[PDB]
Amino acid sequence: KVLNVWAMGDEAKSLKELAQKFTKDTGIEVKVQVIPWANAHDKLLTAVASKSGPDVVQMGTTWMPEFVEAGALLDITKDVEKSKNMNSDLFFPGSVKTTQFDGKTYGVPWYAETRVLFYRTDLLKKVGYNEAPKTWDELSDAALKLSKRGKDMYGFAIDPNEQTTGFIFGRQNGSPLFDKDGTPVFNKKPFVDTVTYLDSFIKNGSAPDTDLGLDASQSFGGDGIVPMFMSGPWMVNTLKDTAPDIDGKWATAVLPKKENNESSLGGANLSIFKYSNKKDDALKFMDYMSQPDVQLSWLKDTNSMPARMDAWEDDMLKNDPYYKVFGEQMKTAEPMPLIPQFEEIAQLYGKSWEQIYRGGADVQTQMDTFNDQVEALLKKLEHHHH
Ligand SMILES: [Zn+2]
Ligand SMILES: [Zn+2]
Ligand SMILES: [Zn+2]
Ligand SMILES: [Zn+2]
Ligand SMILES: [Zn+2]
Ligand SMILES: [Zn+2]
Ligand SMILES: [Zn+2]
Ligand SMILES: [Zn+2]
Ligand SMILES: [Zn+2]
Ligand SMILES: [Zn+2]
Ligand SMILES: [Zn+2]
Ligand SMILES: [Zn+2]
Ligand SMILES: [Zn+2]
Ligand SMILES: [Zn+2]
Ligand SMILES: [Zn+2]
């Protein structure tokens, strides 16, 4: 009788609260189970293997490729086209891409995350920039200048464990990452030149090449040791809460442009488990969560940005100087390639990046080795294919 909803994390307090309001509204009873992130993969596969699980599941966008192939997620194409609040035109195009496979829809975008430039407005002004850097040459130039402030002063952070960063810059320089035949092209000139460009901030001392052990407040606040970096919407909240000393001294901006300035697109979708016996009630719970005002309540309780475009007509987003920039970036942002072993490929990239920035490898030779590893990884599907 009760609609089982799987949410991911340590806590699902805010969703329980919206689920209790949904129940008061619809007479639909909802039980939210909290699945720790390090158990969700195997928990969901177990549900598939046992043809028994929740009715609605929170799906990280990068997990969609594997759970669609695994048969975990119901084809809801027909149901969402005739819905009020779940139609694909109502969501950011990149969020929509994460739901669509062989022309079919396996979920509804719920909340979206994209990566923007965080910068110290006073520090950029100091080195001659009235606005955020707008191009790769400016990001390079502004960062080298900021690094000459002092001994352990920097200009820009390249996070060596951030999976998106390499590929976001690659696409900006016109790498498609995989060609039309699915062949990896990490060793071709648009991607190789991108990695040379990222490597230049390390070699020139404008990006840290070790773990400085600074939290965001410590690195970005104060004198602004690392005065520019890239992050998601969660960092707005963190800076306001942990670095009040820099109030009115920082902003977000859209990423600097090369051929384009497009960012990554991630977050979560709501999907129906394939063997749900309550599809009707699942679709009703999902359509409530797709309503603009619920997306805005969710944003207030958890700072997750709406995937529903109409929510962005609210003043708390439209006219917020931090979040409006995430809204603009969202418009053209592109999910990381939606294949089941992307996270492995991100990881191989991480290692190659390390061999360059730390071990001084040649960029072209190292990208040749990386491209060969991706090819090998793709041939034998050791993980995540079904
Ligand atoms: Zn919470
Ligand atoms: Zn080109
Ligand atoms: Zn060093
Ligand atoms: Zn807060
Ligand atoms: Zn609430
Ligand atoms: Zn408007
Ligand atoms: Zn585009
Ligand atoms: Zn290492
Ligand atoms: Zn060379
Ligand atoms: Zn192996
Ligand atoms: Zn894995
Ligand atoms: Zn394994
Ligand atoms: Zn897997
Ligand atoms: Zn496959
Ligand atoms: Zn399987």
Nearest ligand to the CA atom of 301: 5
**Of the bound ligands, which one is closest to the alpha carbon of residue 42?**
13
Q: How many CB atoms lie within 10 A of CB 203?
A: 13
User: Rounded distance, CA 247 to CA 355, Å?
Assistant: 38
Structure token pair of residue 345:
């490929």
54 CA → ligand 13 middle, Å: 18
Q: How many CB atoms lie within 10 A of CB 293?
A: 12
Going by C-alpha positions, the residue among 96, 237, 206 that lies closest to residue 141 is 206
Give which of 61, 35, 101, 57 is closest to 271, Cα–Cα: 57
Number of neighbours of residue 298 by Cβ within 10 angstroms: 21
Q: What are phi and psi of 232, to 5 degrees?
A: -95, 180
Q: What gap in Å lies between CA 152 and CA 156, rounded to an integer?
A: 13
The pairing of beta strand 266-272 with beta strand 3-8? unpaired
What's the 332 CA to ligand 7 centre distance in angstroms?
A: 5
Parse the chain into domains and list their residue ranges: 1-114+264-337, 115-263+338-386
96: its two tokens: 């929509």
Q: Is 79 annotated to bind ligand?
A: no
Per the entry, the structure determination technique was X-ray
Closest CA to 33 of 53, 52, 60, 63: 53
Angle, CA 236 vertex, CA 235 and CA 239 arms, to 5°:
80
The CA angle 311-117-245, to the nearest 5 degrees, is 95
251: left (phi over 0), alpha (psi -120 to 50) or beta: beta
Which residue(s) pair with 31 in the sheet? Answer: 4
Cβ atoms within 10 Å, residue 237: 12
Name the phi and psi angles at 109, rounded to 5. -65, 140
Of the candidates 28, 311, 334, 360, the residue with the CA atom closest to the CA atom of residue 172: 334
Residue 179 CA to ligand 12 center (angstroms) comes to 28
Q: How many CB atoms lie within 10 A of CB 81?
A: 12
Q: How far is the CA of 209 from the centre of ligand 3 (A)?
A: 5
User: Residue 32: beta bridge partners?
Assistant: 5
**CA 56 to ligand 5 center in whole angstroms:** 20
For residues 191 and 94, what is the distance between their CA atoms, to the nearest angstrom? 22
What is the C-alpha to C-alpha distance for residues 60 and 37, in angstroms, rounded to an integer?
Answer: 10
Distance 382 CA to ligand 13 centre (A): 9
3-state secondary structure the chain: CCEEEEEECCCCHHHHHHHHHHHHHHCCCEEEEEECHHHHHHHHHHHHHCCCCCCEEEEEHHHHHHHHHHCCECCCHHHHHCCCCCCHHHECHHHHHCCEECCEECCEEEEEECCEEEEEHHHHHHCCCCCCCCEHHHHHHHHHHHHCCCCCCCCCCCCCCCCCHHHHHHHHCCCCCECCCCCECCCCHHHHHHHHHHHHHHHCCCCCCCCCCCCHHHHHCCCCCCCEEEECCHHHHHHHHHCHHHCCCEEEECCCECCCCCCECEEEEEEEECCCCCHHHHHHHHHHHCCHHHHHHHHHHHCCEECEHHHHHCHHHHCCCCHHHHHHHHCCCECCCCCCCHHHHHHHHHHHHHHHHCCCCCHHHHHHHHHHHHHHHHHCCCCCCC
- Residue 91, Cβ neighbours under 10 Å: how many? 26
Residue 313 counted as an annotated binding residue: no
- Residue 306 makes CB contacts below 8 A (sequence gap 6+) with 111, 112, 292, 295, 296, 298, 299, 312, 317
Q: Is 241 annotated as a binding residue?
A: yes
* Centre of ligand 8 from the C-alpha of residue 360, in Å: 13
- What are the Cα distances from residue 214, in Å, to 115, 154, 353? 20, 13, 21
Residue 196, both tokens: 């040379």
Is CATH 3.40.190.10 the right assignment for the domain spanning 1-114+264-337? yes
Taking the centre of ligand 7 as the mean of its atom positions, its distance from the CA of residue 339, in whole angstroms, is: 19
Q: How far is CA 247 from CA 50, 216, 224, 261, 310, in A?
A: 52, 14, 13, 27, 29
**147 annotated to bind ligand:** yes
- Could you tell me the two tokens for 15? 């969703």
Question: Could you give the C-alpha distances from 252 to 117, 119, 231, 322, 323, in angstroms and in order?
Answer: 6, 6, 10, 6, 8
* Ion ligand 2 residue ranges (Cβ < 5 Å): 174
CA of 225 relative to ligand 5 center, distance in Å: 36
Question: Which residues make Cβ contacts (< 8 Å) with residue 263, sequence separation at least 6?
Answer: 114, 115, 116, 168, 254, 255, 329, 332, 333, 334
**Which ligand sits nearest to residue 309's alpha carbon?**
6
Report the distance separating Cα 189 and Cα 176, nearest Å: 11
Residues β-bridged to residue 135: 257
CA angle in degrees (0–180, nearest 5) for 28-31-33: 155
Contact assessment for residue 235 and residue 113, using Cβ atoms and an 8 Å cutoff: no
Which ligand has an atom closest to residue 378 CA?
14
113 is in an annotated binding site: no
CA 167/CA 355 separation, integer angstroms: 17
| Residue 382 in marked binding region | no
Distance 35 CA to ligand 12 centre (A): 21
Give the C-alpha separation, 346 to 344, whole Å: 5
**Alpha-carbon span 196 to 203, nearest angstrom:** 10
Residue 314 CA: which ligand is closest?
A: 6
Residue 343 to residues 62, 66, 111, 336, Cα–Cα distance (Å): 8, 11, 20, 10
